[PDB]
Amino acid sequence: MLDAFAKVVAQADARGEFLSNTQIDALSKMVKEGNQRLDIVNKVTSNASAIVTNSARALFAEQPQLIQPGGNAYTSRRMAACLRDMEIVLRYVSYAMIAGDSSVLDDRCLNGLRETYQALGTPGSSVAVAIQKMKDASVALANDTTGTPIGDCSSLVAELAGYFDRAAVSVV
């Protein structure tokens, strides 16, 4: 677990060097983004119950064999375990948004998860469909104005969409 600022420190310690003058200036742009990166984390945390439930309901409507008897999300215990995997992947994506680096996401959440769902029988191609539905619910909610001043947050929601795409190809 290291953020975007500690990532460039760890890369420079492997070379044994001080930070370059263009590396300080690129970290001063991240401080300037700042207040806006905290708007994206605030907007997907305040709606985290509805990102999960609306995209769970949309998943069992297109794939009805998941809740048929014998399907993977058929029981009370297996349904409540599908809903908390969606809530855990959404939790570590918002951790990686506030850090600016996908290092909390693929050490705490994504590492070893593909080989775990295969040991359990969980269809990893269907977990990826449920992650991609939470992506569209998050980026449609990241760029609405709704209490924020008007401006350009386009390269920050292109980074939020990139974390959801990384988690969706790592479960399968």
Partner 1 sequence: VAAKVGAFWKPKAPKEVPYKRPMGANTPELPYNTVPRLV
Partner 2 sequence: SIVTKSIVNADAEARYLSPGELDRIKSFVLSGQRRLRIAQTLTENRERIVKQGGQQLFQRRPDVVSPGGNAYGEEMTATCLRDLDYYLRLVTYGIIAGDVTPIEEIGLVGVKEMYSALGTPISGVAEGIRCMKDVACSLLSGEDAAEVGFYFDYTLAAMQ
Ligand X SMILES: *[C@@H](C)[C@H]1/C(=C/C2=NC(=C\c3[nH]c(C[C@H]4NC(=O)C(C=C)=C4C)c(C)c3CCC(=O)O)/C(CCC(=O)O)=C2C)NC(=O)[C@@H]1C
Residues forming the site for partner 2 (CB under 8 A): 15-21
Contact status: 105 vs ligand CYC (CB under 6 A): no
Q: How many residues bind ligand X (CB under 6 A)?
A: 15
Q: What one-letter code names the amino acid at 127?
A: V
Residue among 107, 106, 110, 162 nearest 135 (CA): 162
CB 26 to partner 2: min, Å: 15
- Please pick, from the candidates 47, 54, 65, 143, the single residue that binds ligand X as defined by CB under 6 A: 143
Structure tokens at 35: 């207040």
Is 109 assigned a ligand-binding role in the annotation?
no
Q: Tell whether residue 16 is a contact of ligand X (CB under 6 A).
A: no
**Rounded to an integer, what distance in angstroms lies between the CA atom of residue 43 and that of residue 14?**
37
Is there binding between residue 132 and ligand X (CB under 6 A)? no
Nearest alpha carbon to residue 152 among 29, 14, 24, 36? 36
The dihedral through the CA atoms of 145, 151, 152, 158 has a sign that is negative
What is the gyration radius of the CA atoms in the chain, in angstroms?
A: 18
Residue with tokens 């709704």: 146
152 annotated to a ligand binding site: no
* Residue 21, binding choice from partner 1, partner 2, ligand CYC, none, Cβ under 5 to 8 Å by partner class: partner 2
Q: Which stretches of the chain bind ligand X, using CB under 6 A? A: 35-36, 38-40, 42, 142-143, 145, 148-151, 153, 156
Binding residues for (2R,3E)-phycocyanobilin: 35, 39, 72, 77, 82-88, 153
